Design a protein around this ligand. Structure first.
Ligand code: MG
Ligand code: MG
Ligand code: MG
Ligand code: MG
Ligand code: MG
Ligand code: MG
Ligand code: MG
Ligand code: MG
Ligand code: MG
Ligand code: MG
Ligand code: MG
Ligand code: MG
Ligand code: MG
Ligand code: MG
Ligand code: MG
Ligand code: MG
Ligand code: MG
Ligand code: MG
Ligand code: MG
Ligand code: MG
Ligand code: MG
Ligand code: MG
Ligand code: MG
Ligand code: MG
Ligand code: MG
Ligand code: ZN
Lengths: 50, 105, 118, 203, 86, 58, 122
RNA sequence: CGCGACCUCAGAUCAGACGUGGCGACCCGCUGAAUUUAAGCAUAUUAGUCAGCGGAGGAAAAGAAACUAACCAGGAUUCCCUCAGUAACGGCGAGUGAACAGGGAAGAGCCCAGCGCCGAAUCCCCGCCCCGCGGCGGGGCGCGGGAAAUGUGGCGUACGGAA
C-alpha cells in the first residue's frame, strides 16, 4: 500500500537491496564454490511473508 | 507366559530405567585422580603421617562382629584426661578426638 | 487552624534538587552527527543536473537522522552559501535525498563547479 | 533478665492478659495492609533468639497470609482422569503457611536476604508473621566476620529453595530411622540414588 | 464457498513484527507476541519443543559481549595494565 | 536484675511502652522484692535524663 | 606523509582537531570524486583517509581518558566509566580486606593452639 | 493558643548502594498426569515420573545426634561394595521395597540467643591531613552527625561454664 510505516519501508528497502545477482569477479577466487545467487526472490512467485 | 519348569522372576525394570544408567567408564580416570590428590596432600603435609591422625581401638557393635577390633572416630575425653593430654592440644599435635564416645568399661 | 473542606489532601513538602557527588558518566559524549557526517555526497544524475540548472537547487544525499534545519546549517557551514528552503524525501533504497534551493543571488552552476560536480 | 519473663509471658498465651493483647494486635494488623515494614520487632526476645540484632541492616516485615487449606485449581471441579485423583476440596499444601509468608516477603524484598520468621497473631481468616531480613550490602554487615556468611552468593533466596527453618520443616530431613526416605541430600537425591542402574565395567 | 471463494476475502493481517524477537508473531488485537511474549518480562520458552529451544538460544546469535568475556577469562580479567613498551 | 538482687532504692517505670509486655511483669516483681516503684508519664521524658531518644525504666 | 600514531601523542588537542578536520574535508572530496566517477588512485586513497580519521580520533580519546583518570585517581567517588569493569559477580564479591578480617575469639583460638609440625617414628 | 520531645506514617530527579533478565548438562523447593501393566477394570502400576512454576553454584543440597543399638557397644555429613531383590508393602494379584551392623574414598569442626559480669567498653557516615589506590584501605585530628539501654561489643554454649 502507499500508506507505509517507517519500519516497514526500511525493511522493504533492505530486502530490495539484497535482491541482487552476484558480481562475476568473485567467480574467479581461489576457494570459491558459488556459481549463482540461490537466494533470489521474484515478487510474483515468492511473497516475502509480512 | 511361563513355560515348563522354571523359576518365576520379578525384574524391577518397569520404570524409565534407561534414563538413569550410571556407567563406569571413568573409573580408571577417577582412580588416577584420587591417587594424584593423595600424593599432593601427602607432599603438602611434609613430615606428618600421610594417613592423618592416630585413631583408637574400637569394638564392633553387634553380636555378629563384637569379637573384632577396628579403628574408631577419635579418642574419648576420659581417655584424654587420664592420659594427661589437653582437649584442644591433642588435635594440634595430631590426635583424633570426639566428645561423643562413652567409656562403659 | 480550622478545616473548611471535608477532604484531607497530602501536604506539599520541600523537594530538594539533585546535586551529584560525582558525575554518572566520565565525559560528555561526542557529537557524531556533525556537518561532515551529516552530508554524504551530491547526486550526479540527469535529473540532478536539470534541477541545478533550472530551479537553482542542489541535490544531496544525507543520512536518515538529519532534519531540514541541520541540513541547512550543514550546507551553510561547508559551502559558505545561503539556503532558501529544503525539500527532503527518503528513497526506496534507504538513503535520504535532499533538494536544497539557494538564495537568488548565488548561482547553482558556480556552486557545483566549486564543489566538483558537473 | 527481662527476656526470660517475656518468654514465659509469651508461653502463657491462654491467659486473659495475652488474650487481650492478641485480640488488639490482630485487629490492628488486620486493619493494616498485607505487606508492610514494622519499625521494631513485636517480640524482641523471639527475634533475638531467632537471630536478630539491633544493628543497621536488619529489617522486620509484618505480613498477612490468608488462612485455610488449598483447593485444586481445576475448572469446575473436572479432573479428567482416574477416580483416585478426583478430589479438589480437602487437599493440603506441602509447605507451611509460615514458609509461604517468608517466600512472598523475600520475593517482594529482592535485594534483602531472609533469616527467619516468627508468629505474632492469627484470626479465623488470616495469620500474621514477622520476617527478619538482612541487607547484605550494608557495611555494618559486610565487615562483621560472624554474619558476613549471609553475603555469599550461595545464600541468595534461601526462602525460595527452602533453606530457612520453615522451609526445612516440610522437607522431612533429619537424623534417625524415621527419616529414611531422605538419606542423602534430599528426598529427590535419595530417590535418584535408589532408582539408578549401576553398571560396572566388569559388573 | 468453503474454500477457493472464501480464500479471496483475506486482506488484513493478524500479526506484525515484534520489537523483541523480530518474528511476525506480534498479535495486534491481543498486543502480545506469539513466539516470545514480548510484553511479559520473561522470555517465552517451553520444554516440549527442543527444536524451538535450540532455534534461538545463546549459541545462535552474535555473542557480542560473551565471546569477549571468554577471551578475557582466558587471561583472568586483567585491567589497567599494558604490555611492556619497546 | 538490680530489683531481683535488691540493689535498687526505687524504680521508675514508663507507662506507654508500645509492647506493654516488656514491663507488665515489673510491678509485681518490685513489690515482691520490696523495692518501691513508680509510674512516670512519658518514656520520652524518661529517656531525656539519659542522652537517648527513649528509655523504658530507670 | 604517512600519518602514524607515534608522532601524535606529543601533539596538542587543537592541532589534532584541525588535522582531523582537514582529513575529513579530504575524505568528502574523495567521496564526491567516487560518486561522479574518478580515478582508482583516489578510490584506493579513500580507505587510507578513513583509517587516518580513525587513528586521530582514537589518539584524542585515549589522551582525554588518561587525563581524566589522573584527575579522578585520588578521589573516592569516580564515574562508572573510570571504575574497574570486571564481571558483575566479581564486583559484588567481598573485597580483600573484609573477607580476611576475623573475629577476636577465633583469632585468640588460633594464637593459643597453632597447628604444630610433627613426625612419627616408623 | 503556641512551643518542645517521643511514637506511627508520608513526599522527594535528596547522598550513597542493591534487585530485575538470560543459559539451564548437573542441583534445591513446589505442582503433578495419562498412555502402559494387571491379558477386562475402579485400588494398585506407570510414578513424586513427563509437562508446568520458582531459585542458585562451580558444584548444589546435607552435616556435627531430641542418632543407631541392646553388644565386651558404636559415634557429623556425602559417595562406592555388601546388606538385598532381604524385613516389610500389595484386589497379599500384577507388582513394589529400605535401613542397621561390616569393608572402604574423604576426614574438621564450630558459633549464637538465653543465665551472668564489664562506666555502650559497640557500630555506620561526613570534613581535613599523610600514605596506599583499579578488590576503597590504614593512621592522626573534629565542644562533627547518627544507630543503640525496646540491648551493641568482650568472656561464654551442654565436650559443662563463670568467679
Ligand atoms: Mg499471488
Ligand atoms: Mg513356547
Ligand atoms: Mg491424588
Ligand atoms: Mg505433592
Ligand atoms: Mg546449611
Ligand atoms: Mg512439627
Ligand atoms: Mg481479529
Ligand atoms: Mg523463564
Ligand atoms: Mg561472642
Ligand atoms: Mg539520588
Ligand atoms: Mg533469575
Ligand atoms: Mg489393561
Ligand atoms: Mg491386553
Ligand atoms: Mg481397555
Ligand atoms: Mg489407580
Ligand atoms: Mg507413586
Ligand atoms: Mg519436568
Ligand atoms: Mg555463574
Ligand atoms: Mg553449601
Ligand atoms: Mg551439639
Ligand atoms: Mg543372596
Ligand atoms: Mg514407588
Ligand atoms: Mg553403614
Ligand atoms: Mg583414607
Ligand atoms: Mg548480647
Ligand atoms: Zn516477540
Amino acid at each position: 500500500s502507499s500508506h507505509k510505516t517507517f519500519r516497514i519501508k526500511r525493511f522493504l528497502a533492505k530486502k530490495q537491496k539484497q535482491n541482487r545477482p552476484i558480481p562475476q569477479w568473485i567467480w574467479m577466487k581461489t576457494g570459491n564454490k558459488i556459481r549463482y545467487n540461490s537466494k533470489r526472490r521474484h515478487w510474483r512467485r515468492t511473497k516475502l511473508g509480512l | 507366559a511361563p513355560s515348563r519348569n522354571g523359576m518365576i522372576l520379578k525384574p524391577h525394570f518397569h520404570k524409565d530405567w534407561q534414563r538413569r544408567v550410571a556407567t563406569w567408564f571413568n573409573q580408571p580416570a577417577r582412580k588416577i585422580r584420587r591417587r594424584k590428590a593423595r600424593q599432593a596432600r601427602a607432599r603438602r603435609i611434609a613430615p606428618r603421617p600421610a594417613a592423618g591422625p592416630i585413631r583408637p581401638i574400637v569394638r564392633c557393635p553387634t553380636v555378629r562382629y563384637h569379637t573384632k577390633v577396628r579403628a574408631g572416630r577419635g579418642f574419648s575425653l576420659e581417655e584424654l584426661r587420664v592420659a594427661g593430654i589437653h582437649k584442644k592440644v591433642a588435635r594440634t599435635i595430631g590426635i583424633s578426638v570426639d566428645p561423643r564416645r562413652r567409656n562403659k568399661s | 487552624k480550622i478545616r473548611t473542606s471535608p477532604t484531607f489532601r497530602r501536604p506539599k513538602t520541600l523537594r530538594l534538587r539533585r546535586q551529584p557527588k560525582y558525575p554518572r558518566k566520565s565525559a560528555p559524549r561526542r557529537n557524531k552527527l556533525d556537518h561532515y557526517a551529516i552530508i554524504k555526497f551530491p547526486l550526479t544524475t540527469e535529473s540532478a543536473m536539470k534541477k541545478i540548472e533550472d530551479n537553482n537547487t542542489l541535490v544531496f544525499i544525507v543520512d536518515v537522522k538529519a532534519n531540514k534545519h541541520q541540513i541547512k546549517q550543514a550546507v551553510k557551514k561547508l559551502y559558505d552559501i545561503d539556503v532558501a528552503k529544503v525539500n527532503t524525501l527518503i528513497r526506496p533504497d534507504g538513503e535520504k535525498k535532499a533538494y536544497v534551493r539557494l538564495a537568488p543571488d548565488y548561482d547553482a552552476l558556480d556552486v557545483a563547479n566549486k564543489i566538483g560536480i558537473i | 533478665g527481662a527476656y526470660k519473663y517475656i518468654q514465659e509471658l509469651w508461653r502463657k498465651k491462654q491467659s486473659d492478659v495475652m488474650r487481650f493483647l492478641l485480640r488488639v494486635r490482630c485487629w490492628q494488623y488486620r486493619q493494616l495492609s498485607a505487606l508492610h515494614r514494622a519499625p521494631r520487632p513485636t517480640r524482641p526476645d523471639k527475634a533475638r533468639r531467632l537471630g536478630y540484632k539491633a544493628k543497621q541492616g536488619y529489617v522486620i516485615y509484618r505480613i498477612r497470609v490468608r488462612r485455610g487449606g488449598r483447593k485444586r485449581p481445576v475448572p469446575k471441579g473436572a479432573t479428567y482422569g482416574k477416580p483416585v485423583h478426583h478430589g479438589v476440596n480437602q487437599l493440603k499444601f506441602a509447605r507451611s503457611l509460615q514458609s509461604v509468608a517468608e517466600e512472598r516477603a523475600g520475593r517482594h524484598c529482592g535485594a534483602l536476604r531472609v533469616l527467619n520468621s516468627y508468629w505474632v497473631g492469627e484470626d479465623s481468616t488470616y495469620k500474621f508473621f514477622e520476617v527478619i531480613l538482612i541487607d547484605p550490602f550494608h557495611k555494618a554487615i559486610r565487615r562483621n566476620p560472624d554474619t558476613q556468611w549471609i553475603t555469599k552468593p550461595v545464600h541468595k533466596h534461601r526462602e525460595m529453595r527452602g533453606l530457612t527453618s520453615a522451609g526445612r520443616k516440610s522437607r522431612g530431613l533429619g537424623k534417625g530411622h524415621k527419616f529414611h526416605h531422605t538419606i542423602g541430600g534430599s528426598r529427590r537425591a535419595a530417590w535418584r540414588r535408589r532408582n539408578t542402574l549401576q553398571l560396572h565395567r566388569y559388573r | 464457498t468453503k474454500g477457493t471463494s472464501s480464500f479471496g476475502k483475506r486482506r488484513n493481517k493478524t500479526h506484525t513484527l515484534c520489537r523483541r524477537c523480530g518474528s511476525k508473531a506480534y498479535h495486534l488485537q491481543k498486543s502480545t507476541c506469539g513466539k516470545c511474549g514480548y510484553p511479559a518480562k520473561r522470555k517465552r520458552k517451553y520444554n516440549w519443543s527442543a527444536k524451538a529451544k535450540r532455534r534461538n538460544t545463546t549459541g545462535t546469535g552474535r555473542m557480542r559481549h560473551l565471546k569477549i568475556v571468554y577471551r578475557r577469562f582466558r587471561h583472568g580479567f586483567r585491567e589497567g595494565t599494558t604490555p611492556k613498551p619497546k | 536484675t538490680l530489683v531481683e538482687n535488691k540493689k535498687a532504692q526505687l524504680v521508675v517505670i514508663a507507662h506507654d511502652v508500645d509492647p506493654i509486655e516488656l514491663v507488665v511483669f515489673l510491678p509485681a516483681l518490685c513489690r515482691k522484692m520490696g523495692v518501691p516503684y513508680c509510674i512516670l508519664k512519658g518514656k520520652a521524658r524518661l529517656g531525656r535524663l539519659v542522652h537517648r531518644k527513649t528509655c523504658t525504666t530507670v | 606523509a604517512k600519518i602514524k600514531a607515534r608522532d601524535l601523542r606529543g601533539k596538542k588537542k587543537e592541532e589534532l582537531l584541525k588535522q582531523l578536520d582537514d582529513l575529513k574535508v579530504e575524505l568528502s572530496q574523495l567521496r564526491v570524486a567516487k560518486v561522479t566517477g574518478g580515478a582508482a588512485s583516489k578510490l584506493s586513497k579513500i580507505r587510507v583517509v578513513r583509517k587516518s580519521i580513525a587513528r586521530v580520533l582514537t589518539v584524542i580519546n585515549q589522551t582525554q581518558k588518561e587525563n581524566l583518570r589522573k584527575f579522578y585517581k585520588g578521589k573516592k567517588y569516580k564515574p562508572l566509566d573510570l571504575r574497574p569493569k570486571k564481571t558483575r559477580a566479581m564486583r559484588r564479591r567481598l573485597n580483600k580486606h573484609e573477607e580476611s578480617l576475623k573475629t577476636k575469639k577465633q583469632q585468640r583460638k588460633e594464637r593459643l593452639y597453632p597447628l604444630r609440625k610433627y613426625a612419627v617414628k616408623a
